[PDB]
Amino acid sequence: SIVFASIDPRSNPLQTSSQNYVDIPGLKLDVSKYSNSPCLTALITLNIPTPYASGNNFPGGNFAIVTDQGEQLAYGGFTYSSKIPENSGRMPFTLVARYSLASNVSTIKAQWSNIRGSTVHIDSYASISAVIQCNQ
Amino acid sequence: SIVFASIDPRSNPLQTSSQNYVDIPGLKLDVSKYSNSPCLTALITLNIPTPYASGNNFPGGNFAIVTDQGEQLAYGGFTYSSKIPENSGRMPFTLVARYSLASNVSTIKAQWSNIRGSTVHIDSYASISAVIQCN
Amino acid sequence: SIVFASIDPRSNPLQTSSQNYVDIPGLKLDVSKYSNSPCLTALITLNIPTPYASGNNFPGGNFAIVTDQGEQLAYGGFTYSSKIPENSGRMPFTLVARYSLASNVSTIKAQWSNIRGSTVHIDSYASISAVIQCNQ
Amino acid sequence: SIVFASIDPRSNPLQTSSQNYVDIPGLKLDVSKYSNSPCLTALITLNIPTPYASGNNFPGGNFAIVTDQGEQLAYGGFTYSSKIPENSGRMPFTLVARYSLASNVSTIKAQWSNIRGSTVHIDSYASISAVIQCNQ
Amino acid sequence: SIVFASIDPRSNPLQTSSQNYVDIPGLKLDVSKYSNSPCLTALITLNIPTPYASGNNFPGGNFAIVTDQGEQLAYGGFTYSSKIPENSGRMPFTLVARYSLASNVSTIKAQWSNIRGSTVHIDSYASISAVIQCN
Amino acid sequence: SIVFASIDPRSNPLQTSSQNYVDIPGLKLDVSKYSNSPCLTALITLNIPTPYASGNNFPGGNFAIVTDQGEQLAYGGFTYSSKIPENSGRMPFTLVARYSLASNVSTIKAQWSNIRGSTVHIDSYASISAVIQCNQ
Numbered sequence: 001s002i003v004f005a006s007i008d009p010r011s012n013p014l015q016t017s018s019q020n021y022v023d024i025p026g027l028k029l030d031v032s033k034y035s036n037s038p039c040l041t042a043l044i045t046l047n048i049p050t051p052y053a054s055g056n057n058f059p060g061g062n063f064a065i066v067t068d069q070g071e072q073l074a075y076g077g078f079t080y081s082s083k084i085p086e087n088s089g090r091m092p093f094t095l096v097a098r099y100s101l102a103s104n105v106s107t108i109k110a111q112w113s114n115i116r117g118s119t120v121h122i123d124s125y126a127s128i129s130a131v132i133q134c135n136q
Numbered sequence: 137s138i139v140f141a142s143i144d145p146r147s148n149p150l151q152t153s154s155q156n157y158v159d160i161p162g163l164k165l166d167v168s169k170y171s172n173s174p175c176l177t178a179l180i181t182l183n184i185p186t187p188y189a190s191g192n193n194f195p196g197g198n199f200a201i202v203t204d205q206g207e208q209l210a211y212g213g214f215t216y217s218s219k220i221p222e223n224s225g226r227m228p229f230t231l232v233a234r235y236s237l238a239s240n241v242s243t244i245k246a247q248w249s250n251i252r253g254s255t256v257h258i259d260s261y262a263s264i265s266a267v268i269q270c271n
Numbered sequence: 272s273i274v275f276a277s278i279d280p281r282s283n284p285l286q287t288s289s290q291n292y293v294d295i296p297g298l299k300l301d302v303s304k305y306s307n308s309p310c311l312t313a314l315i316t317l318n319i320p321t322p323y324a325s326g327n328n329f330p331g332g333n334f335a336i337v338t339d340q341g342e343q344l345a346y347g348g349f350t351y352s353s354k355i356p357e358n359s360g361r362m363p364f365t366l367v368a369r370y371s372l373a374s375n376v377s378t379i380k381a382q383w384s385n386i387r388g389s390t391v392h393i394d395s396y397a398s399i400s401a402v403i404q405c406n407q
Numbered sequence: 408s409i410v411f412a413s414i415d416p417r418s419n420p421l422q423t424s425s426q427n428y429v430d431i432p433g434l435k436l437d438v439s440k441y442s443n444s445p446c447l448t449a450l451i452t453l454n455i456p457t458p459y460a461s462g463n464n465f466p467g468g469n470f471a472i473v474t475d476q477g478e479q480l481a482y483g484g485f486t487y488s489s490k491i492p493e494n495s496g497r498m499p500f501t502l503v504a505r506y507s508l509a510s511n512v513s514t515i516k517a518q519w520s521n522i523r524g525s526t527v528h529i530d531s532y533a534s535i536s537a538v539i540q541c542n543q
Numbered sequence: 544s545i546v547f548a549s550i551d552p553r554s555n556p557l558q559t560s561s562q563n564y565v566d567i568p569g570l571k572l573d574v575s576k577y578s579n580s581p582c583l584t585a586l587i588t589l590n591i592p593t594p595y596a597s598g599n600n601f602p603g604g605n606f607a608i609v610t611d612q613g614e615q616l617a618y619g620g621f622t623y624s625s626k627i628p629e630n631s632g633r634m635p636f637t638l639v640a641r642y643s644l645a646s647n648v649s650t651i652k653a654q655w656s657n658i659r660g661s662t663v664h665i666d667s668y669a670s671i672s673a674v675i676q677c678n
Numbered sequence: 679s680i681v682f683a684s685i686d687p688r689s690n691p692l693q694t695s696s697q698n699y700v701d702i703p704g705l706k707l708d709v710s711k712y713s714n715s716p717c718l719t720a721l722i723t724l725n726i727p728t729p730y731a732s733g734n735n736f737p738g739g740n741f742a743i744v745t746d747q748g749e750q751l752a753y754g755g756f757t758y759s760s761k762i763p764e765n766s767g768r769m770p771f772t773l774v775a776r777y778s779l780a781s782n783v784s785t786i787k788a789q790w791s792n793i794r795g796s797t798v799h800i801d802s803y804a805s806i807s808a809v810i811q812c813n814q
């Protein structure tokens with residue numbers, strides 16, 4: 001089966017200047033119905049196709065996929081190659097994780113954080129999705 | 137089940153200077169066999185791993201996943217951080233959408249458009265795919 | 272079903288300056304259980320969310336998804352827009368391939384190569400995965 | 408998926424002389440996890456491999472598969488060919504039903520009743536099962 | 544997936560005195576949608592839980608599961624142990640077959656025939672069903 | 679998935695006068711490929727549509743579904759209602775079992791045995807089958 005969540009914050013863009021990972025609002029998957037299922041795995045894709053980061057010390061952004069149990073399943077990020085980008089451009093980002101649903105997990109969700117004091121921005125479509133399948 | 141299409145225009149590169157979204161030829165999924173099925177869902181991924189855009193005003197490219205009846209299911213894109221890039225680099229792009237197959241939709245396809253008068257280019261492997269599952 | 276492998280070589284980072292494609296250590300899928308299945312397809316995703324490439328002639332890196340018989344299923348890459356990037360930044364990369372399991376192939380793996388004498392680097396999470404399903 | 412329940416009441420056999428259908432203890436399936444699924448069907452099999460019915464007017468037994476709302480999905484029965492069987496023998500019985508899970512029903516169960524004042528008996532293994540699958 | 548048909552001829556009982564296998568009306572599965580699929584298989588169950596047969600020479604009935612092109616996939620039946628049963632009792636019957644769906648077969652159906660000049664009877668619920676799965 | 683085995687011993691009928699359960703030749707399912715799979719269940723149907731038993735003390739026959747580990751999953755049987763049947767008739771028999779494939783099982787097979795010194799006979803089509811499914 002498929003679980004999916006998307007956002008499209010054009011009118012009210014999202015930003016973070018947090019050095020610690022914080023949730024991205026709206027990018028949460030409920031896997032409640034599959035908790036404690038030794039027979040199931042989720043393949044989770046976080047898609048942030050058009051982020052940018054503003055700043056003056058090689059800005060960028062980081063993203064993670066995490067469970068409600070606080071387990072960080074995957075992480076990565078983008079950064080620019082100039083110290084002070086002329087105008088911070090859109091750097092597409094995707095992240096893929098796996099999670100065994102054997103444990104008592106109920107949520108898989110997206111998080112983000114800054115780097116080198118940047119501000120990370122999302123102002124357009126983004127999604128988190130999972131394909132949940134039997135291990136056989 | 138999986139549905140998949142790919143292109144590899146290495147001997148015949150694709151480009152657009154269109155300000156309006158237009159189809160990327162060959163990146164289309166025929167979902168006719170699954171349509172009119174309210175309990176099926178598709179999770180669609182557009183993968184354009186090596187695009188670039190030329191131009192002189194912070195060039196870039198935008199992409200979308202659309203139905204044959206013109207509903208935009210997802211969109212996004214890349215841009216460079218310099219007004220006139222020294223040599224427009226390859227900026228990998230992936231886009232993920234979801235679509236219920238309840239309607240009489242027959243095709244899900246990829247579209248592209250330019251940014252600030254750029255020309256967007258694909259000259260190598262790219263794909264569109266879907267995983268189609270019961271709810 | 273899902274097949275999955277990930278690496279997180281933070282303590283012992285990976286790199287290549289190979290002009291020719293070589294395996295990325297650890298990013299291999301074992302599909303031998305499904306070899307020669309006439310009605311199964313795999314959708315394979317190579318996710319390298321945080322690579323970079325150092326060098327001084329428009330550096331970058333190329334990636335491919337390949338079978339153990341040497342068939343290249345997909346390929347692509349990233350490159351910077353300056354000849355000599357001030358400090359080569361993180362350029363997220365994802366690649367999707369399809370593979371019919373109607374084959375005696377037993378392993379699918381990730382490969383990489385350099386561009387214009389660059390060195391490509393992975394020093395954090397990366398994954399390769401497949402969703403395997405019946406064509407009907 | 409499979410849902411299953413069996414009984415083996417060798418030490419504490421079951422019987423009924425009820426003219427009206429009553430539940431067979433223990434032969435119930437819990438389908439509440441699938442309640443109100445619009446695209447799922449269950450193929451239900453009631454297997455009573457070793458029943459008999461005692462009595463002196465062409466005895467036998469009837470069985471049904473019923474929802475917790477009282478809907479009879481299937482029914483059938485066995486009877487002997489003599490008015491007064493010399494010693495009522497074991498007459499294997501199987502019954503198959505279909506059930507759409509597009510319903511708020513939470514339990515499917517087996518029922519039994521007598522014939523012509525018989526007593527029906529189960530003193531060994533019996534089962535009720537369902538295979539649950541998506542219609543597509 | 545599941546395919547299923549049932550009958551309940553309580554107000555219009557069925558019977559046969561045919562020595563040759565003949566169709567039981569209504570116990571047929573349309574497998575057209577799955578045909579020409581070499582990698583699909585059907586597991587078919589015929590369930591006739593309450594049949595009986597009348598007659599005076601050890602009566603009984605035989606059943607088969609057959610394709611529309613006349614291939615017999617399974618067969619079996621019941622009989623009484625007395626030459627002239629006092630009153631022909633209900634003898635539950637179930638039959639299970641397998642069929643590859645590689646061919647252009649469109650129907651799998653139930654058939655019946657008599658034994659030693661009997662008349663076979665169905666006057667209540669009966670079904671035919673299949674579970675259809677990838678190999 | 680489906681596993682299936684059938685016999686049709688018209689030319690060379692099968693019989694047993696064993697009071698202990700013995701294998702029915704040819705009614706064996708190989709579940710090797712699913713051993714040690716906590717995520718899988720098998721629903722197993724033994725179908726002996728046309729058996730009979732000869733004898734002079736209420737003859738009949740018993741059948742079981744058993745694993746290679748010697749676990750008896752299900753059992754049942756038929757018997758006649760007269761001490762000495764005029765001519766032992768065909769008494770259709772079906773048996774349904776479930777097995778969790780979490781254990782190291784490789785075969786599920788059919789067995790039979792006599793009762794009260796009878797001889798059990800099969801001279802026509804019979805099958806054993808399983809539907810194997812994810813528990814979710």
Ligand SMILES: CC(=O)N[C@@H]1[C@@H](O[C@@H]2O[C@@H](C)[C@@H](O)[C@@H](O)[C@@H]2O)[C@H](O[C@@H]2O[C@H](CO)[C@H](O)[C@H](O)[C@H]2O[C@@H]2O[C@@H](C)[C@@H](O)[C@@H](O)[C@@H]2O)[C@@H](CO)O[C@@H]1O
Nearest residue numbers: 013051052087088089090123193194196214215216217251
């Ligand atoms: C202060 C200012 O005018 N800056 C503009 C910048 O616009 C600002 O940021 C955008 C995202 C939006 O919130 C504006 O309201 C805001 O003023 C320009 O950004 C473009 O703005 C247009 C709308 O006018 C679109 O939103 C477009 O997508 C924006 O460009 C994208 O986002 C930028 C931050 C870069 O990543 C660029 O590559 C993208 O295409 C930019 C355009 O060059 O110019 C000034 O900096």
Ligand SMILES: CC(=O)N[C@@H]1[C@@H](O[C@@H]2O[C@@H](C)[C@@H](O)[C@@H](O)[C@@H]2O)[C@H](O[C@@H]2O[C@H](CO)[C@H](O)[C@H](O)[C@H]2O[C@@H]2O[C@@H](C)[C@@H](O)[C@@H](O)[C@@H]2O)[C@@H](CO)O[C@@H]1O
Nearest residue numbers: 057058060078079080081115116322323358359360361394
């Ligand atoms: C050679 C040097 O000192 N340059 C630093 C650089 O650190 C070097 O490279 C990183 C990858 C690591 O191996 C260091 O041991 C090494 O000194 C800085 O890179 C950052 O280093 C910090 C730790 O000090 C973190 O590891 C951080 O993630 C690194 O930045 C990332 O990787 C870089 C190569 C760039 O892609 C950057 O955009 C990333 O965020 C950089 C930081 O600007 O500064 C000097 O160049």
Ligand SMILES: CC(=O)N[C@@H]1[C@@H](O[C@@H]2O[C@@H](C)[C@@H](O)[C@@H](O)[C@@H]2O)[C@H](O[C@@H]2O[C@H](CO)[C@H](O)[C@H](O)[C@H]2O[C@@H]2O[C@@H](C)[C@@H](O)[C@@H](O)[C@@H]2O)[C@@H](CO)O[C@@H]1O
Nearest residue numbers: 458459494495496497530735736738756757758759793794
């Ligand atoms: C009342 C009596 O003594 N009659 C016996 C009968 O035993 C009775 O019924 C069985 C079911 C059990 O509850 C006994 O305690 C009770 O005495 C015999 O039945 C067999 O009994 C043996 C044990 O002694 C086994 O239990 C065996 O499975 C029984 O036969 C089966 O059940 C019968 C009711 C018939 O359906 C028969 O065909 C089965 O095989 C019978 C055996 O012929 O003999 C007296 O009638």
Ligand SMILES: CC(=O)N[C@@H]1[C@@H](O[C@@H]2O[C@@H](C)[C@@H](O)[C@@H](O)[C@@H]2O)[C@H](O[C@@H]2O[C@H](CO)[C@H](O)[C@H](O)[C@H]2O[C@@H]2O[C@@H](C)[C@@H](O)[C@@H](O)[C@@H]2O)[C@@H](CO)O[C@@H]1O
Nearest residue numbers: 600601603621622623624658691729730765766767768801
């Ligand atoms: C010794 C004798 O002639 N007995 C017959 C019996 O035939 C014997 O058993 C059958 C199964 C077969 O192996 C014969 O070669 C053997 O002689 C009759 O059984 C029927 O035989 C015909 C063939 O001539 C068919 O095989 C038919 O299906 C048999 O009847 C079935 O099996 C019986 C054992 C009973 O269960 C009956 O109800 C079945 O229909 C019988 C027929 O009444 O008559 C003599 O007993």
